[PDB]
């Protein structure tokens, strides 16, 4: 008759009545995003999202979340990428990310597209998800930089990549973290994130307050003394080192 909340370090949570074994299994389980408001509500088995419908957390009463389902039929499921498949629904956006960021021309000279805040947010705010296919450090490190524009180290065994042609929003928009440009004076950082659709990935989180329509940037963090990096970054490392 009791409800349980299980938080991840990133601030997302699973919430619901657990079954006889303390498992998040049932028809009224929810994943709640770190805004404590956007939710995916429905059928879960041992914490894995089978059918999550988009909802808004309207209140909690005695610890129990009360949701309203959003109109339409936006449904989501656990859909972890593989080495060759980025997503079963490449064009289905993440509903939390879609309210926080958009892609447009970067303000950085010659940098192509960039990622921008849709609204004003405070520090420590998760803005965007960096999902991609999962490949090895060996494959990535043993191939040319021209193929490594979007590679992100996840851990000691896995690199996340958004390979062509999925680097174009018309082909892939389920997540947008690969659209954030680099800065040596960034307003965001990469952080671990456990996503109900993508699984274990990284996210982009603000390290300070950001304004509406501000470009989001992250330090790519290439090794400066192995520099092991693409030319544009090396040219920029020089400039940045000068300003110091």
């Amino acid at each position: 008759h009791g409800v349980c909340w299980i938080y991840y370090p990133d601030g997302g949570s699973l919430v619901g009545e657990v079954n006889e074994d303390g498992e998040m299994t049932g028809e009224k389980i929810a994943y709640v995003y770190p805004d404590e408001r956007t939710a995916l509500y429905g059928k879960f088995i041992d914490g894995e999202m089978i059918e999550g419908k988009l909802a808004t957390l309207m209140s909690t009463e005695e610890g129990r979340p009360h949701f309203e389902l959003m109109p339409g039929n936006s449904v989501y499921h656990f859909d972890k990428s593989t080495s060759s498949c980025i997503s079963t629904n490449a064009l289905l956006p993440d509903p939390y990310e879609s309210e926080r960021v958009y892609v447009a021309e970067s303000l950085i000279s010659s940098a192509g597209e960039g990622l921008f805040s849709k609204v004003a947010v405070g520090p420590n705010t998760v803005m965007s998800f960096y999902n991609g296919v999962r490949i090895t450090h060996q494959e990535v490190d043993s191939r040319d930089w021209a193929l490594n524009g979007n590679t992100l180290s996840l851990d000691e065994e896995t690199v996340i990549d958004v390979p062509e042609p999925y680097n174009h929003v018309s082909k892939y928009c389920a997540s947008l973290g690969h659209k954030a440009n680099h800065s040596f004076t960034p307003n965001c950082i990469f952080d671990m994130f456990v996503h109900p659709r993508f699984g274990p990935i990284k996210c982009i989180r603000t390290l300070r307050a950001v304004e509406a329509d501000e470009e989001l940037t992250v330090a790519y963090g290439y090794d400066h003394s192995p520099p092991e990096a693409p030319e544009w970054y090396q040219v920029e490392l020089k400039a940045f080192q000068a300003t110091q």
Binding site: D141, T151, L152, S153, F190, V218, Y220, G221, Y222, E228
Partner: peptide
């Protein structure tokens, strides 16, 4: 490594 954000 030829990827972002390695430890």
């Amino acid at each position: 490594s030829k990827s972002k954000d390695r430890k």
